[PDB]
Write an enzyme that holds these catalytic residues in place. Structure first.
Site, PDB file in Angstrom:
ATOM      1  N   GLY A 174       0.883  -1.140   0.000  1.00  0.00           N
ATOM      2  CA  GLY A 174       0.000   0.000   0.000  1.00  0.00           C
ATOM      3  C   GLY A 174       0.916   1.182   0.000  1.00  0.00           C
ATOM      4  O   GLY A 174       2.113   1.026  -0.198  1.00  0.00           O
ATOM      5  N   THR A 175       0.367   2.363   0.222  1.00  0.00           N
ATOM      6  CA  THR A 175       1.185   3.553   0.250  1.00  0.00           C
ATOM      7  C   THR A 175       2.028   3.472   1.505  1.00  0.00           C
ATOM      8  O   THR A 175       2.020   2.456   2.205  1.00  0.00           O
ATOM      9  CB  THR A 175       0.335   4.813   0.326  1.00  0.00           C
ATOM     10  OG1 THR A 175       1.156   5.950   0.073  1.00  0.00           O
ATOM     11  CG2 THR A 175      -0.299   4.952   1.718  1.00  0.00           C
TER      12      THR A 175
END
Lengths: 111, 243, 249, 241, 243, 198, 243, 234, 245
Positions: free
Chosen positions: E29-30
């Site tokens: 994910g980020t």
């Protein structure tokens, strides 16, 4: 002993003309021998060209009406914004009212 | 490969219910038990299967049980599955007595039970009863009656029936000598005169049996139900064909 | 392997529920245990094995008291037995003592226990208990008793018998030296000489746990004044009482 | 394969499990319903093959549901007993809530209702029974005859049959039963029901059950002799031509 | 392997792969980071502008719990919001019972116990996110970082997401050259810095930075969003050092 | 209350039951049948609270009938009354109990003996040679104590029962609008439509 | 072909491997722990490895305080152990409430060995992959030590060990107890006992410890406490010369 | 050889950390017709391309009201949308009767996300197969959102979903500076939306029978223009 | 090959095959035809009986929902009986609450919100019934707002309104023909001979008033199911025009 009811006076009136109809009702609001407001409406437009007023115990009145108006809202949502025939409306109000047959709304309503 | 016998909730392309059939197959692994109708009584004879030198058997029982004061049954198949039923079979029997203040009719009791066995055959998550039953009793409706029921939930009324091991043999022999009126002391005779022929043991020893009968007449205007004791057996056994 | 032995709900083509037999295998594995019925008593015993002597074995019973007239032992999965026990001591009150103002006869407790044993079977979603118990006791109208209870839920009565690894023969030994007369002291004897061959460890007072049902102990109550309340018949021998009977073979 | 569950459609839109249940109805003995114009007659066959058993309380395959309605089946015996019970109770509950006793269609509908309910959710198995319901509605005189299948569908017929070798008996009926003019006599309406089973009975009237139902809650089973009195009269004209 | 299909199942070495795969989805994910200054903490997340049609200042990834807890995560965004609503009830009922706003350490278990649970039953999917959070209570500030197995601890500052290592080495550092609590203000600044440096894995995808913080002196015990001027400064105070 | 009489004779039971139905001030009917046949040889009269009265009667009737087709055998007077007392028994301890009193008079084709059971709403059952519910007893019980004999003919019973009614008329404040009589025996139930047609 | 996938199926030899595998997970902890009892105290030892300059060690323990007298150490994943720690932590509270007195070590361990049995027979969840070691100073047995495992087992220990090094820490004690011929450590105060473990452990592992490589707790006359950070350095010093 | 034992249930993570069943769901949104939405600072707009069966059947609508100030258009499985738009109508009504405040659009996103949420974490079910573009006008003026079956609601300035939606999104991405400023005038904000949608036609062109439009803003309660009334844009 | 066994399983290209097969179940039903005209709406069906001993009217392929709404089904009959039942209750209830007649599409709507109740597992709410219904519906009705309407209900859960439509084994050829016949200015008697003609065509057996059922609904008399004599002569009167041209 807690008594859940109260009478806020008031009087409403509804006449049906040949091709129009009226529904009036004074604005005074009371409790026993005092005044709570000299201007507090008890006659509302509910949409689809229908006027309604529930008079008796202030609160049950506001409740019924709100409950009725939220009902017109959904009648549209489910039948393609179809108009609510005033007759169809009264039949509906019956069920609302009889819904509480054993803890009745202490009010005399008129559309 | 791939077979339709994985559960009770499944019909094979030909409408067979294998799981039920296999249960019906578990019976041929049980000790032989017999029931013979008579003009004046009903006889229940069984042959204890389990065995060992040090196995208490003069007190406790394993195949013959009293359900009602007028009804008895011979078991054959899964020991535990048998008690679960036998008990409810007893409760139902008492509710009828408690409601109608009369004793419960045989067929009604057999039908109620067959109806439970039926049910464990149609609902998922359930395994049918691996039991078979020979019901012997009497009611004012149809006098003496002999009934049988299997795991599939069906029941029927015989004049002389056998269930368990070597049913083919036991069934055959009976089909032959059974005289339709045959008195009681001739059925108790035919009981062993069949159980004997279809055993294995070098000799048929008393400690390996279970008898019970139902008699009634003008005397006691009602039914007397007896479950023979190790004694009476070892005795009536000699009176026949054992040293 | 079959394709029928992995479901309590499933019958093999012949008619044998499967999961049950494998459960019954965990039992035929457990440590050897026996029980002998006398004429004036009954003896139940089972061996003890130490993971390491660093552990206190005197804080984990194997011969348990269900009612002050009934005790029981086992062979198979340890942990099951521990709770199967406490559920038995309760189903003994709620199901009898609290309805009849008295404790239950041998026969019916063993059946009230096999009842709980039954449930484990009839129902997918749970596994049966990997234990098999020998329950021994005595009640007024039935004299003394000996019973075995397996995961299958069934249960039978013996005069003497054994369950466990060293059972094939132990059950052979007993068969030979048993007769309707043995007084309790004899049974207590015959037991040790059978709990004898069935070991590879030792034979002290700890690695042996044996108890017996016999005469009433007007001492083991805690009160006195009520005539009929006479005492508990169940007695779990202490480490000492033992090794003494071991010297005299 | 797709015939493993009740909740799965095969690519061509089938549901085999329910279909296979029907394959069991064919296993059971034969039943045949024949209506006239003042009566209705049901007939069956007795599995007289392995007997050294009782006789007294032997099932007749035909059962009364109410004073004016009888039902007959074919297929899984044990399965059938529950439908017969459930329909019997409902028949009495209807009188309790509406005074009026049930109609033959209302009953048929209730039954098939059950049979279909047992093909809905999984963890349930369809009854392996197929049934014929005959009778007369309250204060009515038009004979009625319906049939229900394990799937849940019901239908009315002028005459119909189910069970093993029902294809044969059906052929027969078809070329004999006149749609324009039904048997006008209880006696001939029987005669016709008998002669039809007399193609699968394997000789003897010891293998045939006949029950007759007329209006006004008037129902009545038949005896072994009476039944043979027809096997007799039809064994005449048989070689008579 | 047949041990990576179910969520409850143990592999022969006591390994629960389904939870592990859960982590693989988290570390993709980020990037999310968490700084613990002297009194209070600082949070910051990397928002990814995919297209120009994305109203800026909107679509917030940081949620407040009660009114004193920061909270940021990485991975499956919906699983995110979820795990937090629970935290929001868990919080509320606690204050309604004891009056005193919930202890940051207490709060963590509640969440762990919950995430914990989704590793027990095979009918549900483990949480697909790593969460970082904290706030200031009676014992000052704390900063934790919960993960997919429900495992968690207290940190001096930490971060998860596709680019976390750089965030870590450039994080351990700040610790070494400051062994004695960082700085309220300064934290923010250095925060916006630690993100950029870590964004070099999304380089070709222009992004938007979001910072929130909680401090006994600048926020006044309450958790607030870093918007406005100090928000700019911190950016440049990082855009400058980026050169 | 309503009138409910019943008397067992040589080989049959007789049931008397006033015909009127009254709602407050008026009499909505003077031809009501408080009877309800449970089976070919069992009959049951009732009297009690307005609604409770026949809802219950029909309910009982439905159970018996169900049992009868199912078993294809007819339940006996003794067992039938037993079932009733069971229900009413459970009824008394329920949110709201049926307030119904009854009389069951059937013919036991098995013993060839008539039997009459009297049961009150509390679940109190008793087998009697003759009975009555409510106030009905005080005006009659003495006359029957006096003349009743177990050897009596059906023909004699009626004559007796006639006397009891004549007394009920002379001293009872309520005008029950006459009674309807019914006979149960080896041949079933029939109505003496000639105590009315007289 | 999946015995070992379901927590409820017996292998042909009554095994239930899922319960077995449960154990290996109690090892991937890589922490060792031994507990020994004094004469009016009880002490448990366990290493405190913190492989990250970011995790603040204060929040890094495997020993919690169940009640104001009982302490517990766990040989497993912080998520699972944190669960168990809670249930037991609550059984305590409720027991007291329902019986008027403080719950004994020996009991709590049985509620758990039972709880993790029903936990495991009804199949309402996967078994926790940890070993629990309960210590305290009972008022009917003082130096008390009981240890439960995933298979629902437990027993008393005069002093035991747990970790990737069973035997070492164990045998080393079997030879020290093989001498004293008694079943407990002799000493008037805890302080000295503590010193005995560290002492008698480094011996088995072969490594030195500081005020951060270890972790210990002890039980007194009703008052369980965790050894301080700095304070653990103390006895470490005192016993660094009396060799 | 070459299977994928990780796509059978929404409740299973593939080795890399992907939920394939959810992915397949989006794939069904791509198979549906196109729909566009764009907004300025005074209005929001939904433009949709209704589809049909025969020359005898009717075109299936895809614009749905929710309150006087809110609505959405859909792509994909019609039924799923019904359930969703309905859950939304409910949420607004509560926030209206109880508090007497018009439900803010952002909130409607969270709500539609958390509901779509539940279906990706439990056994037995399947994820909603339908994307929605929501529009509304709360106390922060115009608003546009884009929700996907994974529970991801993102707030844009414009967008399109559906087969060929691509081209329209491109267009919108350029004309941005232009329309984001079309304030006070609705007729031009719609002509913009209509241009952008035509960038996605391949079969036919928009006729009065298959074009649907909807607007809401400053002094324009959510209203829907159907058929014969959208003629002045064709 | 592998994704068609779960009603809650998306195929790699976002498809729900079990639902598709569901539909394929309808094709097995016999043909049903509906044609709408500004004069009223018509419904006709092929009966198709296995035997001459069946009682025709036993096969309810066309039924009344209310005085102003009727319909014809195709597919699994048991599954139909359940929808017909729900539909009827839906109508009557609405009447009770509003003292008016339910809009044809609002009724059709409730029928679809029913099929929408398939699926077993438990991810939140609860809708007990395992799979899709195996049947479609042709709902012909009339209301004061949109006049004579005709709908097609599918187990998928969606529906369209038609001017004319055909379902069942023959919907292949039937739908083609109708595509080239229907026109807004059709009289009622005209549509009757058309529905009647297309059946005979893509039907099979000699078209007799026994294997073909015909019905219609109008503002004036509501739903009426043409008796045998009428249909019978409507057939003759039909088959005749075939001679010339």
């Amino acid at each position: 002993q807690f008594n859940p009811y109260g009478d806020n006076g008031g009087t409403i009136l509804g006449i049906a003309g040949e091709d129009f109809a009226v529904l009036a009702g004074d604005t005074r609001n009371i409790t026993d021998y005092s005044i709570n407001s000299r201007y507090e409406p008890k006659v509302f437009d509910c949409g689809d060209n229908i006027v309604m007023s529930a008079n008796g115990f202030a609160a049950d009145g506001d409740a019924l009406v709100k409950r009725f108006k939220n009902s017109v809202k959904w009648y549209h949502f489910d039948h393609n914004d179809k108009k609510l025939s005033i007759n169809s409306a009264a039949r509906n109000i019956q069920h609302l009212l009889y819904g509480k047959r054993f803890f009745p709304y202490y009010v005399h309503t008129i559309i | 490969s791939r077979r339709y016998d994985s559960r009770t909730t499944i019909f094979s392309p030909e409408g067979r219910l294998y799981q039920v059939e296999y249960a019906l197959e578990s019976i041929s692994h049980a000790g032989t038990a017999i029931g013979i109708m008579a003009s004046d009584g009903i006889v229940l004879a069984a042959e204890r299967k389990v065995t060992s030198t040090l196995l208490e058997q003069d007190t406790s029982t394993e195949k013959l049980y009293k359900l009602n004061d007028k009804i008895a049954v011979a078991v054959a198949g899964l020991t535990a599955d048998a008690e679960i039923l036998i008990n409810t079979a007893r409760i139902h029997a008492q509710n009828y007595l408690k409601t109608y203040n009369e004793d419960i009719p045989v067929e009604i009791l057999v039908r109620r039970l067959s109806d439970i066995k039926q049910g464990y055959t149609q609902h998922g998550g359930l395994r049918p009863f691996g039991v078979s039953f020979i019901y012997a009793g009497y009611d004012d409706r149809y006098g003496y009656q002999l009934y049988t029921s299997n795991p599939s939930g069906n029941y029927t009324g015989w004049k002389a029936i056998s269930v368990g091991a070597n049913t083919s043999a036991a069934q055959t022999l009976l089909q032959m000598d059974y005289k339709d009126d045959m008195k009681v002391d001739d059925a108790i005779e035919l009981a062993l005169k069949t159980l004997s022929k279809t055993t294995d043991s070098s000799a048929l020893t008393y400690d390996r049996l279970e008898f019970a009968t139902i008699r009634k007449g003008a005397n006691d205007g009602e039914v007397y139900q007896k479950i023979f004791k190790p004694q009476e057996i070892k005795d009536i056994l000699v009176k026949t064909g054992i040293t | 392997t079959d394709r029928y032995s992995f479901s309590l709900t499933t019958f093999s083509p012949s008619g044998k529920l499967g999961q049950i037999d494998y459960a019954l295998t965990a039992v035929k594995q457990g440590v050897t245990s026996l029980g002998i019925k006398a004429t004036n008593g009954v003896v139940i015993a089972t061996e003890k094995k130490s993971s390491s002597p660093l552990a206190m074995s005197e804080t984990l019973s194997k011969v348990s008291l269900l009612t002050p007239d009934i005790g029981a032992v086992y062979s198979g999965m340890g942990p099951d037995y521990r709770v199967l026990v406490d559920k038995s001591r309760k189903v003994a009150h709620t199901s009898y003592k609290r309805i009849y103002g008295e404790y239950p006869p041998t026969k019916l407790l063993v059946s009230e226990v096999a009842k709980i044993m039954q449930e484990a079977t009839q129902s997918g979603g749970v596994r049966p208990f990997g234990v098999s118990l020998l329950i021994a006791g005595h009640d007024e109208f039935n004299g003394f008793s000996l019973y075995q209870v397996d995961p299958s839920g069934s249960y039978f009565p013996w005069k003497a018998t054994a369950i466990g690894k060293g059972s094939v023969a132990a059950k052979t030994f007993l068969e030979k030296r048993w007769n309707d007369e043995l007084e309790l002291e004899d049974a207590i004897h015959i037991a040790l000489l059978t709990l004898k061959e069935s070991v590879e460890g030792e034979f002290n007072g700890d690695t042996i746990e044996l108890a017996i049902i016999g005469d009433e102990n007007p001492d083991l109550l805690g009160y006195t004044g009520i005539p009929t309340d006479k005492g508990p018949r169940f007695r779990k021998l202490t480490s000492q009482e033992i090794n003494d009977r071991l010297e005299a073979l | 394969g797709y015939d493993r569950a009740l909740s799965i459609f095969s690519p061509d839109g089938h549901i085999f499990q329910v279909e296979y249940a029907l394959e069991a109805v064919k296993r059971g003995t034969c039943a045949v319903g024949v209506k006239g114009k003042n009566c209705v007659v049901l007939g069956c066959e007795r599995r007289s093959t392995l007997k050294l058993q009782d006789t007294r309380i032997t099932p007749s395959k035909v059962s009364k549901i109410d004073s004016h309605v009888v039902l007959s089946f074919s297929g899984l015996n044990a399965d059938s007993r529950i439908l017969i019970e459930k329909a019997r109770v409902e028949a009495q509950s209807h009188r309790l809530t509406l005074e009026d006793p049930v109609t033959v269609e209302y009953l048929t509908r209730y039954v098939a209702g059950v049979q279909q309910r047992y093909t809905q959710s999984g963890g349930v198995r369809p009854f392996g029974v197929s049934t014929l319901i005959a009778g007369f509605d309250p204060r009515d005189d038009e004979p009625k005859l319906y049939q229900t299948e394990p799937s849940g569908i019901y239908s009315s017929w002028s005459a119909q049959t189910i069970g093993r070798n029902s294809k044969t008996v059906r052929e027969f009926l078809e070329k004999n039963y006149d749609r324009k003019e039904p048997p006008a006599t209880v006696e001939e309406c029987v005669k016709l029901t008998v002669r039809s089973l007399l193609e699968v009975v394997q000789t003897g009237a010891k293998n045939i059950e006949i029950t007759v139902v007329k209006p006004d809650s008037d129902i009545v089973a038949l005896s072994s002799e009476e039944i043979n009195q027809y096997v007799t009269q039809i064994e005449q004209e048989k070689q008579e031509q | 392997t047949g041990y990576d299909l179910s969520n409850s199942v143990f592999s022969p070495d006591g390994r629960n792969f389904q939870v592990e795969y859960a982590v693989k989805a988290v570390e993709n994910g980020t990037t999310s980071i968490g700084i613990k200054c002297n009194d209070g903490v600082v949070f910051a997340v990397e928002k990814l502008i995919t297209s120009k049609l994305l109203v800026p200042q909107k679509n917030v990834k940081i949620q407040v719990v009660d009114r004193h807890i920061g909270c940021v995560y990485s991975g499956l965004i919906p699983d995110g919001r979820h795990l937090v609503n629970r935290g929001r009830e868990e919080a509320a009922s606690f204050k309604k019972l004891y009056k005193t706003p919930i202890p940051i350490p207490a709060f963590a278990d509640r969440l762990g116990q919950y995430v914990q649970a989704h590793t027990l039953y095979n009918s549900v999917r483990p949480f697909g996110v790593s969460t970082i959070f904290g706030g200031v209570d009676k014992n000052g500030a704390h900063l934790y970082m919960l993960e997919p197995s429900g495992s968690y601890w207290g940190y001096k500052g930490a971060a998860t997401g596709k680019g976390r290592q750089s965030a870590k080495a450039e994080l351990e550092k700040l610790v070494d050259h400051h062994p004695e609590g960082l700085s309220a203000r300064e934290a923010v600044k250095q925060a916006a810095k630690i993100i950029y440096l870590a964004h070099e894995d999304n380089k070709e995808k222009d992004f938007e930075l979001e910072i929130s913080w909680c401090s006994l002196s600048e926020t006044n015990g309450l958790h607030k969003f870093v918007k406005g001027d100090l928000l700019q400064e911190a950016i440049d105070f990082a855009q400058k050092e980026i050169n | 209350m309503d009138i409910i009489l019943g008397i067992r004779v040589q080989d049959s039971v007789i049931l008397a039951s006033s015909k009127a139905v009254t709602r407050g001030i008026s009499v909505l009917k003077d031809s009501d049948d408080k009877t309800r046949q449970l089976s070919p040889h069992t009959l049951m009269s009732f009297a009690g609270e307005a609604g409770d009265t026949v809802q219950f009667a029909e309910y009982i009737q439905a159970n018996i009938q169900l049992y009868s087709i199912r078993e294809d055998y007819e339940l006996s007077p003794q067992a039938v009354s037993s079932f009733v007392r069971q229900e009413l028994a459970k009824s008394i301890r329920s949110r709201r109990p049926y307030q119904v009193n009854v009389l069951i008079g059937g013919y036991d084709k098995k013993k060839n003996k008539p039997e009459l059971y009297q049961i009150d709403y509390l679940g109190t059952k008793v087998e009697l040679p003759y009975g009555a519910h409510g106030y009905s007893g005080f005006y009659t019980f003495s006359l029957l104590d006096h003349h009743y004999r177990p050897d009596m003919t059906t023909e004699e019973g009626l004559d007796l029962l006639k006397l009891c009614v004549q007394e009920l008329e002379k001293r009872m404040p309520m005008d029950f609008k006459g009674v309807i009589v019914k006979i149960v025996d080896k041949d079933g139930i029939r109505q003496v439509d000639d105590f009315q047609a007289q | 072909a999946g015995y070992d996938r379901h927590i409820t199926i017996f292998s042909p030899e009554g095994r239930l491997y899922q319960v077995e595998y449960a154990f290996k997970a109690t090892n991937q902890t890589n922490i060792n722990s031994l507990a020994v009892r004094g004469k009016d105290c009880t002490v448990v030892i366990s290493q405190k490895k913190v492989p990250d300059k970011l995790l603040d060690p204060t929040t890094v323990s495997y020993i919690f305080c169940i009640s104001r007298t009982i302490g517990m150490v766990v040989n497993g994943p912080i998520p699972d152990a944190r669960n168990a720690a809670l249930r037991a932590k609550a059984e305590a509270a409720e027991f007291r409430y329902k019986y008027g007195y403080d719950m004994p070590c020996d009991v709590l361990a049985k509620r758990m060995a039972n709880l993790s049995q029903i936990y495991t027979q009804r199949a309402y969840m996967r078994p926790l992959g940890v070993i629990l070691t309960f210590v305290s100073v009972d008022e009917e047995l003082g130096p008390s030590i009981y240890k439960t495992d995933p298979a629902g087992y437990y027993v008393g220990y005069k002093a035991t060990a747990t970790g990737p090094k069973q035997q070492e820490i164990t045998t080393n004690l079997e030879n020290h107890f093989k001498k004293s011929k008694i079943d407990h450590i002799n000493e008037e105060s805890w302080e000295k006992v503590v010193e005995f473990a560290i002492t008698h452990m480094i011996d088995a592992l072969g490594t030195e410890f500081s005020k951060n490589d270890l972790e210990v707790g002890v039980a007194t006359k009703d008052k369980f406490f965790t050894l301080s950070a700095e304070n653990i350095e103390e006895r470490l010093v005192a016993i660094a010369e009396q060799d | 050889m070459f299977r994928n034992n990780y796509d059978g249930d929404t409740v299973t993570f593939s080795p890399t950390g992907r939920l394939f069943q959810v992915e397949y769901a989006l794939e069904a949104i791509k198979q549906g017709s196109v729909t566009v939405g764009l907004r300025s600072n005074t209005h929001a707009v939904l433009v949709a391309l209704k589809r049909n069966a025969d020359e005898l059947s009717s075109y299936q609508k895809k614009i749905i009201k929710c309150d006087e100030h809110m609505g959405l258009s859909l792509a994909g499985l019609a039924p799923d949308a019904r359930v969703l738009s309905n859950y939304l109508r409910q949420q607004c009504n509560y926030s209206s009767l109880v508090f007497n405040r018009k439900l803010a659009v952002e909130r409607a996103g969270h709500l539609l996300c958390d509901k779509a949420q539940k279906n990706t974490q439990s056994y037995g079910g399947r994820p909603y197969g339908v994307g929605l573009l929501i529009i509304g006008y709360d106390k922060s003026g115009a608003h546009l959102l884009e929700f996907q079956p994974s529970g991801n609601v993102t707030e844009l300035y414009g967008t399109a979903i559906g087969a060929r939606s691509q081209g329209a999104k491109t267009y919108l991405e350029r004309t941005l500076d232009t329309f984001i400023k079309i304030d006070g005038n609705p007729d031009e904000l719609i002509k913009a939306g209509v241009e952008a949608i035509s960038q996605s036609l391949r079969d036919e062109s928009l006729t009065v029978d298959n074009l649907s439009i909807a607007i809401v803003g400053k002094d324009t309660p959510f209203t829907i223009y159907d058929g014969e009334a959208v003629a002045k844009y064709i | 090959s592998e994704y068609d066994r779960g009603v809650s399983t998306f195929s790699p290209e976002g498809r729900l095959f079990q639902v598709e097969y569901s539909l394929e179940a309808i094709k097995l039903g016999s043909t049903a035809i509906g044609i709408a005209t500004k004069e009223g709406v018509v419904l006709g069906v092929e009966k198709r009986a296995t035997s001459p001993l069946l009682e025709s009217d036993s096969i309810e392929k066309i039924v009344e929902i209310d005085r102003h709404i009727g319909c014809a089904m195709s597919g699994l009959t048991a599954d139909a009986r359940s929808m017909i039942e729900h539909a009827r209750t839906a109508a009557v209830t609405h009447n009770l609450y509003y003292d008016e007649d339910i809009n044809v599409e609002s009724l059709t709507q409730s029928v679809c919100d029913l099929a929408l109740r398939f699926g077993e597992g438990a991810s939140g709410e609860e809708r007990l019934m395992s799979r899709p219904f195996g049947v479609a519906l042709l709902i012909a009705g009339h209301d004061a707002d949109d006049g004579y309407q005709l709908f097609h209900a599918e187990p998928s859960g969606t529906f369209y309104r038609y001017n004319a439509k055909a379902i069942g084994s023959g919907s292949e050829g039937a739908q083609a023909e109708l595509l080239n016949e229907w026109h807004s200015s059709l009289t009622l008697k005209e549509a009757e001979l058309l529905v009647l003609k297309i059946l005979k065509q893509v039907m099979e057996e000699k078209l007799d008033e026994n294997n073909a059922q015909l019905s219609c609904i109008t503002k004036q008399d509501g739903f009426k199911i043409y008796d045998n004599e009428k249909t019978a002569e409507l057939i003759k009167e039909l088959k005749e025009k075939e001679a010339a041209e």
